[PDB]
Amino acid sequence: DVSLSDVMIARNKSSVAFDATVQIRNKLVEAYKDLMNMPV
Amino acid sequence: ASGAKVGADFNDLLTKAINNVNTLQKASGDLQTRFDRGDADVSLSDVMIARNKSSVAFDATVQIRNKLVEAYKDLMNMPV
Amino acid sequence: ASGAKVGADFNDLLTKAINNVNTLQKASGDLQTRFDRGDADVSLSDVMIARNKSSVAFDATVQIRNKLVEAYKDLMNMPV
Amino acid sequence: EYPTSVVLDWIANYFWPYVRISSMLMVMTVTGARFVSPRIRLYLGLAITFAVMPAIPAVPQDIELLSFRGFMTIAEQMIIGIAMGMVTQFMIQTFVLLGQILGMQSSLLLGQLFMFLTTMFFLATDGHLKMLQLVVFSFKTLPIGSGSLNAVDFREMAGWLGIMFQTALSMSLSGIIALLTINLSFGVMTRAAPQLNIFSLGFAFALMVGLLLCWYILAGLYSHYEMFWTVGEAQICRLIRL
Amino acid sequence: SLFNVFNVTGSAMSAESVRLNTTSSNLANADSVSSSAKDTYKARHAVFGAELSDTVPVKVMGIVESDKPLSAEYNPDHPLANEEGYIYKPNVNVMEEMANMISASRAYQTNVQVADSSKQMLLRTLQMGQ
Amino acid sequence: EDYSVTLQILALMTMLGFLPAMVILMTSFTRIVVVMSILRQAMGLQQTPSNQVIIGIALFLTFFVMSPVLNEINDKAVQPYLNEQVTAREAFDAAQAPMKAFMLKQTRIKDLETFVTMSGEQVDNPEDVSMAVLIPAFITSELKTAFQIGFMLFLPFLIIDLVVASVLMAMGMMMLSPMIVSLPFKLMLFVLVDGWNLILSTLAGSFA
Amino acid sequence: DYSVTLQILALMTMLGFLPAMVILMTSFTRIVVVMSILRQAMGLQQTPSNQVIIGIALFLTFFVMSPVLNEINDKAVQPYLNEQVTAREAFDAAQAPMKAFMLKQTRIKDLETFVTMSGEQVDNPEDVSMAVLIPAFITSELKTAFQIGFMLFLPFLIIDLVVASVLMAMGMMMLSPMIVSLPFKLMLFVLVDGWNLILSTLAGSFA
Amino acid sequence: EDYSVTLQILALMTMLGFLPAMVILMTSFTRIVVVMSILRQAMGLQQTPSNQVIIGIALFLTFFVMSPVLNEINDKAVQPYLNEQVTAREAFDAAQAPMKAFMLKQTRIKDLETFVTMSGEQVDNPEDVSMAVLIPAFITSELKTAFQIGFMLFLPFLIIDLVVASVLMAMGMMMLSPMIVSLPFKLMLFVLVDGWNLILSTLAGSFA
Amino acid sequence: EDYSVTLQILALMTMLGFLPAMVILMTSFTRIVVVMSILRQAMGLQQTPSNQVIIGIALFLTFFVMSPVLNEINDKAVQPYLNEQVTAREAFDAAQAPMKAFMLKQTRIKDLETFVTMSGEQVDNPEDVSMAVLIPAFITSELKTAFQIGFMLFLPFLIIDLVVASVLMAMGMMMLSPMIVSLPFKLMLFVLVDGWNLILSTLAGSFA
Amino acid sequence: EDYSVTLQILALMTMLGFLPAMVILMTSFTRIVVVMSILRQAMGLQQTPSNQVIIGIALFLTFFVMSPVLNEINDKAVQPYLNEQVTAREAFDAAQAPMKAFMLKQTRIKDLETFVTMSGEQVDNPEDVSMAVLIPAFITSELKTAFQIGFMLFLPFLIIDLVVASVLMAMGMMMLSPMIVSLPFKLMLFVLVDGWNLILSTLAGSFA
Amino acid sequence: AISFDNALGIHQHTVGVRERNAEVISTNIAQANTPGYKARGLDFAKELQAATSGDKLYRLPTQPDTGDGNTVDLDLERNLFMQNQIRHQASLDFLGSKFKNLTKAIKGE
Amino acid sequence: AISFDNALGIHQHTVGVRERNAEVISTNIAQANTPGYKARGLDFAKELQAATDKLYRLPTQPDTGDGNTVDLDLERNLFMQNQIRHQASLDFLGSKFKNLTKAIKGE
Amino acid sequence: AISFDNALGIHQHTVGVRERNAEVISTNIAQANTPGYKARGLDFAKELQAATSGKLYRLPTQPDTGDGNTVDLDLERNLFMQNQIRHQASLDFLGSKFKNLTKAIKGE
Amino acid sequence: AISFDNALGIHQHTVGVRERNAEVISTNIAQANTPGYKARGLDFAKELQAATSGDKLYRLPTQPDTGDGNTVDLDLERNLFMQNQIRHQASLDFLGSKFKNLTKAIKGE
């Protein structure tokens, strides 16, 4: 019932979604770490 | 619903695909050796079809494996 | 269950695979040079089978080495 | 089925709970320490999320991984995690406050002595286990999809500076009075002859008594920590609405 | 599912293979008088079928003997003849067997190209996003 | 006309990279930290509160006071954009405006005049001045405002220290340092009046 | 059983997870943390360097965990090479020696906490799943490393307090005690033969 | 024969690579940053204004004071270049000329004299000197000018510090630290004089 | 049975991968860096000698002290291997023997005893331990030796710091920082004693 | 004999990789870098000149002081090389000689003597020592020479600090920190003496 | 915005239709010799519309059949199969570049 | 497991047997005219057993005094069949390494 | 020194000359039937030297049949075949010069 | 032991020898009709040994010449040229793999 097009699209969508959430998590954490390491 | 059900559902999807790829590889192997040993009930067309599907099926397996490893290697290089 | 005992055991396991690869390459080279020199009792199939085996064996040796070297680099370059 | 739904849901059902767990660890007292490498901490967050996965309810499927709403979800998972982490930092640094006020009053690094011992209190009382139990409970009573820290939670967390001074003064009030009365007694008793004065001679006398009083402080510090942890734990449950 | 074209092209390869085997038997038994007049060999032909209830596979539904009358020959010398000295021979027509040989071989090789080109499309699909 | 999905993602990641700047240059983070810096400096403790908890409390305080403006951005900009009601260009402008309004509520007219003349541009309404010129005027007002609050916070601790020194000198003991005696009194009076709660009211409510 | 082509792909993939297995299953975690804590104890910040710290841990985690590798070899590697066992059974035969080592090197309280969090009903400690044992192992090993490391910190904190109070006794309030304490911090570690004392106890700490 | 498009892009990407160097050496960023640094150390506050805020203020100030030269580059080197009116080599020269002129207005002849002799080139007019010689001369002049302004702003805070110490010593309370009591007056003077707006205006007006 | 040429190329190309590990573990690079690192901390300057210059001098020093072992490797293993006198394994063993002699010469017994017991192998003479158990024992010995050398070099600078701090307290100026008033004398002592030559000479001498 | 074109490119591309190493070891970059760090330490400001500016001035100055060497490299090596008058072998040797001559002129005999005995080579005259034995000796002498120049600059600021500390102590205020009071005068001394021109000219003139 | 639909466009539905068309064309080629079989056609516009949100077309023969009844013109089927494969390759390139650009923006690489 | 014997199957031996079979057929065609030569046939199952012989072919027609039992019609057909099957065995055994290399390299 | 004249060698000029030789042979084959046409050759050694530092007649093996044409068609085919083989080798040598040159400037 | 002689084996010499044999066979085919020309043959074992560690023979006729003195059996010469061409290609495949195996070991890929 499934084809290689659906599998490849599912693989690409998962890769893009996973890459999106990792980078945004990385950006926010780097923003948090920058704020913590500042001279009060 | 819990998160384990989604994880188990994802695990069964991977297991089903691996079994399907393994089934094709074993099916191609039998048809290859049946025609190679000299059995007259096996057609060269069916053998070539069998090994064409197994080769494509395994190539799909390689692509998914590389993406999983690349995602994990991407994951381990993250601020934490 | 001593450090020297297991160190020797894995060394024996590791040197066995290296010797197995070396055996395939020497056998492949020996078959090639006998056929190439003009020996009549050497078939091209035996030459081609052996050299295909050596290529696969050496390819595995390089790939396994890359995994070990990358694994070593991962543990040494980690931000302790 | 279309394989997109299966793969996307697991990533959404794993990373989003992991983000809250990981964010709490990086701000936590022990797991967020400078001694541990990020890789060990990263594996710990990965292992904890995988193990506690059955207790985590399924995230809503309405929010997409690649959408601005999903982007907001990642941010608000961190804010919950940092909230728990900052509470743990508040307690330990309050003991660091307790160490330095005694050291300052001792005519004098003493915060590190209290910081190390308070870290031992955190580990010995299984404080790390309780925090991990708190964050998994947060998944139940504070679902990932709908829910985030409100304005009142920010104000309650911003009001912990007064909690620091009140708790630090409460622990040291008996000792600080002792430090003052002996120094005042030493001053008045030696005030008869202005030739002696104190200066550096007063420095030596003050520091010897101050170290001795810190010996008394460590004798009854555990009871104060137990009361302090109850106040902090209640605040954490208030954040997760438990 | 992932190889629907292969099942159809491959079915044609198996279907057209049977038609060539049937043609070979008809030409190899064009002069086999055998015995009697009802056990005599008759030209056989495969029947192709397509069940259209996407892709419609081709299925061989059995071998069917031709309805052409047997070729009668006057030969009151063959011991297997009859009262009037007639030996009935298979109703195999060489011209129609040659045409079937041409049609079967070309159609069989045409499906090879389609099946071979179908694999290329599958291989290119794996390269999506790379 | 509207930005493509690829370009909108690029803009989103860019603002995340500049996120620390937006906190310390556009929000209320600068005023809170400076005021809390004075409070630590006023008392005898030098590094005792430590830098980590001050920033963490400041971050939570900012999220408290920026909650009205952040919610206004959420409603006006994020909600139409998520529902695909408006394009990306106008949604970005709809998010920029509440930040501009908040910065105007915390700035002074003199500060704006200095920078608008400094930029060498022409304008007649403060409401439509470019955010590039509003930012330096905003923080300049924030630093001046924070010094005012810090000066008021420094006075009671100076009052306590001077009284203790005078008492010790009047009793004749010209040999004892006032700092050691005064420190518990400053801390005790900081606790029994619940000083931080009062500072929260005069700092969080100072923006309005 | 899986085809030859697939089972080659399986071992090749997990060959790249070898660093992952080391960090969260063997004794690499405890030693590195104790090494890192002791490095911060002395005034030197990165004098031992990260690479040397890791290199010592890798040698230690091989000597100490040598009994684990022996059992895995003779119970999983050897039967598989003799065709006496299949792929899945050999992999399971390797988990058991490593799961036993991890189970005995954890704290009951941590396992009790994790089984509650995992939501699985297990009556006895020795039957817990590996999915919940791995996080429980590292969590307990972190507590052990912190408790061991900070006790090593105490003698070096004693020197700091002594020298700082002595300097403050003479009114030299501006001289930083850390630079004065640094020569004596190094001497304490070398007089007690620290680099041999900590490693001997760390090796003997495991079981 | 202007540079090919591929080389023109390669040159522009290289200039963006040296963008921090251009700002910190060829612009007004250094002088503003140093003067702010001296002022911060002049008061009792060690790092209360924080480093990111100081650089953030300086970046906006250095952009405003260099808007005239930035516009002159645009009106003489960018727009003719985009309108296909000047050779790319000519446009690069047309952009460099206003930058060189601005750096010469804020440099000292002694700095040029020592660097020209150091480079060992026979040049007489102080307008056709190489950028290799002009940049070190300019940054040297900016450091010296910043010290002069820093000393100017330091004196009033030194006056307050001496007065407070003298008054405390008059009462015989020598044990009391003058710094803790001096600081609120330092904040007091700087805020009723409108220091933040004043100093940034003077720094803006200094570059002329 | 000698290995094939392809394996031998693959075998010694792997040695290049592990080359940094050999320098930091099996060579003299560890002690020299540590001693100069402690020496830098002994003087007032924090990072004036810089890490790269410290490593650069250490690389030259470790090359000069390991020349006899490198020459022995070439004259016992490399030359017979290039001249087809010995096989690959014999060449590998012939290269390792001088390296093992160098590590065993500069190690401690107790450190060897500690590691042989933990590994669990029989030892009757020092020259029977595998390289797997000699490497961790050697680096531990070097760190102890480096710390002892660093302690000696630290003492003369500690004496100066105590003298200059005590003298300032003799006049009664406690607020004046001893560190600033001691740096010129710490640097001068390192000059007229010519530290950069004898200290490197001792490091070279200590290995032989 | 002559290296092939492919090998000549490989060697040249290799030297670009080691370009940072040659700057901090074989040029005047290190001494100028060290002196400014000591000069910055002498004044009260510890990060006011800023690392980027100091390295930027060091890069400009090392370009000016190495120009006679670079021009000799261009004339002796590159011009015969580009005109095919010398081979690749001769060009590289002809380029090395002026660089070796520069390092030999700024080195010390004892430093050369120290490494010559360490390298175990038979050297008759200093002007023919190997490059591997000169680079560690040259950087050693530069560090020692840098300390001597730094001590010269440290004294005038130290005298001001001592003078102001004693004056404050005479008036009885033993709690006022001399560092705050001394800082304006430390800056002024560097200004009216024209320090940023005097120091750099001496550093450039120290290689002649 | 910022969604996979708005980002991929119609290049995800087009690929499925092109594979559907190849299945139809290959069926006609295989069933060319079957008597009585009628050639099957596919409407791309209708199929793409159905795919985006979610009947039998027969091909008119150019010449009469020789009696069998099969209306498959194998000359046309090969030409259409060749065209379908080219347009399918373009669609994969179009769709593949959509994911590459999305990954490029979310990572800045 | 994971050994060349199992990875290659029996395709490693079939190529050799098809070469031996081709040699025998070549001998039969060459020796067709030499009298007294008896046609030699190779039994496929025998070399199958030898992997895990050289028989005589009984004529369908009598000789003509030569005693030679070689039918050139049969030999040509048997040589054509063996050559076609030999190429298929090369394709089967060749793809065994191509799949094996792709599994190891992952590309 | 590093320059293309020293890096490419003569292979930059040899490729061009053999292309000219292809034209010369091609115009001989076309004019095989044209009477009065004399087959012309190209001296590779002389042409290469001219290109590096900067149309002879072929003698008939047999008399012409009477038209006046001295084109020996079988010789032209043999010469064209050899010229095409060496032209491919010249491309192989010259092309490899750039690829090895790129590998040096890139380091991999 | 790492040297081109050890790595390339005898395949670096066999290619040149089989090229020489092809020239000797080709000149026999070309000179088939020249009377007085004796067919020449090259011994492979001798030529390979001479090449390895640093003069073509005469081929005896199976039948007498028909009066021209030429002993070239053009039927035999074609067979030897075909065999030498196949063995020449096989040596090229052997020698070509020797360099490729060295390159992948050096580059690690």
Side-chain angles (χ1 to χ4, degrees), chain C residues 8-42:
Chain C
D9 271 58
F10 282 172
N11 176 83
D12 274 72
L13 174 62
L14 207 60
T15 193
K16 190 193 66 176
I18 297 300
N19 288 19
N20 183 25
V21 175
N22 175 263
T23 297
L24 283 174
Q25 294 183 354
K26 178 182 179 299
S28 164
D30 178 63
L31 284 186
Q32 289 186 176
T33 183
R34 297 209 316 269
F35 178 85
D36 180 72
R37 95 155 68 101
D39 293 355
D41 45 357
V42 178

Side-chain angles (χ1 to χ4, degrees), chain G residues 17-80:
Chain G
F17 281 88
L18 193 51
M21 301 178 181
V22 174
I23 297 189
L24 46 76
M25 272 139 76
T26 198
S27 63
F28 184 78
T29 298
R30 182 196 295 187
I31 303 172
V32 169
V33 178
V34 173
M35 278 296 198
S36 182
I37 292 177
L38 188 77
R39 173 153 58 99
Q40 294 278 36
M42 288 77 78
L44 306 173
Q45 297 181 4
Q46 56 268 135
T47 291
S49 178
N50 300 25
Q51 287 75 24
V52 183
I53 289 302
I54 298 158
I56 298 179
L58 290 180
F59 280 112
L60 288 184
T61 195
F62 167 72
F63 296 155
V64 175
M65 224 212 187
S66 182
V68 175
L69 276 312
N70 188 20
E71 193 180 357
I72 296 180
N73 178 28
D74 301 336
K75 193 180 305 300
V77 179
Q78 298 299 328
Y80 188 68

Side-chain angles (χ1 to χ4, degrees), chain F residues 83-115:
Chain F
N83 303 332
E84 211 162 349
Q85 175 68 20
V86 303
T87 70
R89 320 182 77 100
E90 52 200 353
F92 172 78
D93 301 354
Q96 177 183 0
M99 275 295 184
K100 174 168 298 185
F102 173 78
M103 293 186 302
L104 288 177
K105 262 62 179 180
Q106 313 300 143
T107 188
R108 294 174 174 86
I109 299 94
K110 182 180 182 61
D111 300 331
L112 250 68
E113 178 191 1
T114 293
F115 288 103

Side-chain angles (χ1 to χ4, degrees), chain D residues 105-107 179 182-183 201-211, chain F residues 180:
Chain D
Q105 194 55 233
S106 306
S107 174
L179 249 312
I182 63 100
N183 201 335
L201 179 144
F203 275 92
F205 178 82
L207 73 90
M208 295 184 310
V209 182
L211 296 176
Chain F
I180 48 183

Side-chain angles (χ1 to χ4, degrees), chain I residues 53 57 60 196-197 200, chain J residues 21-32 62 65-66 69 98-113 115 129-146 206-207:
Chain I
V53 182
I57 304 177
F60 280 98
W196 280 125
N197 297 333
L200 300 187
Chain J
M22 299 186 299
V23 170
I24 74 175
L25 296 181
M26 304 168 57
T27 65
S28 164
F29 178 82
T30 299
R31 180 196 293 189
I32 296 182
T62 197
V65 304
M66 298 293 294
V69 183
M99 185 58 60
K100 192 185 72 62
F102 177 85
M103 303 175 64
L104 248 322
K105 194 156 300 180
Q106 310 293 342
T107 193
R108 284 181 166 86
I109 168 181
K110 191 187 307 299
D111 304 6
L112 244 300
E113 179 177 344
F115 285 98
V129 299
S130 181
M131 209 67 171
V133 84
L134 174 69
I135 294 183
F138 169 78
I139 189 62
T140 287
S141 299
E142 289 289 344
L143 292 175
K144 178 181 178 179
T145 305
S206 58
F207 296 91

Side-chain angles (χ1 to χ4, degrees), chain G residues 42 44 47-48 51-52 55-56 59-60 63-64 167 170-176 179-180 182-184 186-187 189-190 193-196 199-200 203, chain I residues 24-25 34 37-38 41 110-111 114-115 118-119 132-133 135-136 139-140 143-144 147-148 151 154 158 161-162 165-166 169 174-179:
Chain G
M42 288 77 78
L44 306 173
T47 291
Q51 287 75 24
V52 183
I56 298 179
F59 280 112
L60 288 184
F63 296 155
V64 175
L167 295 179
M170 300 305 304
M172 304 157 57
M173 63 176 61
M174 203 60 56
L175 193 74
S176 69
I179 191 64
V180 186
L182 177 58
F184 309 114
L186 304 180
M187 259 301 133
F189 190 74
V190 68
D193 192 12
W195 284 121
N196 295 338
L199 303 193
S200 303
Chain I
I24 69 185
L25 293 176
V34 171
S37 178
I38 301 178
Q41 298 290 345
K110 301 177 274 70
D111 301 2
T114 302
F115 280 91
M118 173 180 49
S119 59
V133 84
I135 296 170
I139 51 187
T140 276
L143 288 184
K144 265 189 55 177
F147 283 0
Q148 295 181 1
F151 170 78
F154 213 120
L158 178 59
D161 215 337
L162 290 177
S166 302
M169 285 301 302
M174 54 187 60
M175 303 306 300
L176 184 54
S177 180
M179 303 304 177

